[PDB]
């Protein structure tokens, strides 16, 4: 019944997908699956921003139009969104007209607040450094000619521009920081978005002269819109703004932007400022994850190590927010010792018995001794800590509270030897028998999000009904005995 709503980034098709764009969707789908399971109403985003003077020259050089090479090219990354098993609702792409419509009815709505006015985007800047300086920043040499603070020339350069006021958000921005400590994270975003607004915010140029395959300004449209107005405004064009009676508006404001650290500022300066003068609310928060270093191509990955392995492998490995490193032995390796053996073979030692000794039944449980009762209890409280950590995208700590279970679970089977009590004490067997099978349930639904086709089959290997499935099912809807299980089959592999 509760309305939850994330959204990635919109991925750059001037290229291929490459890992970082692969890693941003896989974790935004894990949280999107993870509050579905948590029984939340989820509406999901992911798409592309197709427009730009980068997108119009790539065209030219290959001779087909800039719509046709966007076509061309997000297919490719709608491609990828398949083979990563994203769940994204509505996938989005600045060419289509719905986006045209709702970047035109906000930036009507800006210049409606009286936030937006023609003028000159006017400065020192330097060809060879790509970058503006203020004057007091430059110094005429002996050549005749001035130079910036790098040592390269600047020129005055001008074009005409519309600019919004950003000027005159920065006590409201600062406010809303104040206000709302979890707006950007993680913590060291924050510092650096609270000291770049407290330092002054200069109004912001929203629209080039210079290409037509971007959405024209309202009232003037040898001026389009640059990328800020454009591709920001995707988020609630995937809802049905400007009109605010479509079903899917009671989605607004999204839950989480998630957002790579490079686009921060555009995400909890920019966006906000233009949501306020447009007079709509703001999103509760926006979590800016780190990159990833080879120390190649997602398709490739995913064919090398198994879907699965490599959502877990991004998730489990970098704490989300930072940087990290992939390689092939660790991929490996992690892979191999969390997922091929401690869950896969503690699920084909466990149910292999089951079908060799106890008929292909979940066997009748006895009581619960000591430790039977430990290891329950710990496989209900790490969901607990795995909804705590999901509110704080740290996904990381979700996965290890999860796989702690299912560690310590091959230490209680082993423990337990229930292979000697075969002979001696066969109830005996059957009751560590549907501890650990009742374990692996409750794992295997808490899993979902992160791998779901292989949580999937676990579960179908345990003869869990569709509809109990939910992290509602954990406490409420154990093993029960007697059950017919299939023959099992291991879940993951070893490489
Ligand atoms: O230049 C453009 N894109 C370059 C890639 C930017 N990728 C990072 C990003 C992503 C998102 Cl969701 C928002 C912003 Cl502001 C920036 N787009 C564009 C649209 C109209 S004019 C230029």
Redesign the pocket.
Known sequence: REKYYITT??A?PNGKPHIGHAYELIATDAMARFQRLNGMDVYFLTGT?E????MLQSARKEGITPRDLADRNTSAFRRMAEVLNSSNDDYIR?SEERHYKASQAIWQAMVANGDIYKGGYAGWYSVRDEAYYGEEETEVRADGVRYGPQGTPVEWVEEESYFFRLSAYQDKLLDLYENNPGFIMPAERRNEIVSFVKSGLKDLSIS?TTFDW??PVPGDEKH?????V???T?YITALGYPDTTDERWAYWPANAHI?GK??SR??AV?WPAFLMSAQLPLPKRVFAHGFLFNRIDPFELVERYGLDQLRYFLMREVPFGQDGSYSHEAIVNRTNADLANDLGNLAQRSLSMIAKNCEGKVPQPGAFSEADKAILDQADAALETARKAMDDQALHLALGAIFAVVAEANRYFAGQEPWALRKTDPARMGTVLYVTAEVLRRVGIMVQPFIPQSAEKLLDILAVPADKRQFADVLASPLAGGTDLPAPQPVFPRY
Do not use: P, Q
């Open positions: 980034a919109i750059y921003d427009h730009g003077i980068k600045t080039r971007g959405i389009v819109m640059y990328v800020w454009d591709a920001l995707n957002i490079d686009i555009f995400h920019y």
